[PDB]
């Protein structure tokens, strides 16, 4: 695999780690839709909206299986720690017009 999951389920926005890089989910978009990070960085998405949102990487992107992130309620967060260089596309399962990518250098 190319990422580890610190918390399998969402956690409170106010619990976000120091050093995490944050991507806000607001205005029905990933507000940083192309994020560039380094190997070993933790990316945290935060849902600012009432509707649930997640991040979803299809099979073969972060590893063999799809990574279907948990549904984040309003003011919840979810993190992934990227361990290998690559370009990792994702989308929102309930709202698949929402697209993003993490580029790990």
Nearer to Cu ion, 11 or 31 (CB): 31
Measured distance CA(46)–CA(10) in Å, rounded: 9
* Interface of this chain with Cu ion, residues 32 to 71, rule: CB under 5 A: 53
Q: Does 2 bind Cu ion (CB under 5 A)?
A: no
What is the nearest approach in angstroms of Cu ion to the Cβ of residue 85? 26
Residue with tokens 């993490």: 102
Closest CA to 103 of 46, 54, 55, 39: 39
Residues in contact with Cu ion by CB under 5 A are 53, 92, 95, 98
Tell me the binding residues: 53, 92, 95, 98
């Amino acid at each position: 695999d190319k990422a580890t999951i610190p918390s399998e389920s969402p956690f409170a926005a106010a619990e976000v780690a120091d050093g995490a890089i944050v991507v806000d989910i607001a205005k029905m978009k990933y507000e940083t839709p192309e994020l560039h990070v380094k190997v070993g960085d933790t990316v945290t998405w935060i849902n600012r909206e009432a509707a649930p949102h997640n991040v979803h990487f299809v099979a073969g992107v972060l590893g063999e299986a799809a990574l279907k992130g948990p549904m984040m309620k309003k003011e919840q967060a979810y993190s992934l720690t990227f361990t290998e260089a690559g370009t990792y596309d994702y989308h929102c399962t309930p709202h698949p017009f929402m697209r993003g990518k993490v580029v790990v250098e």
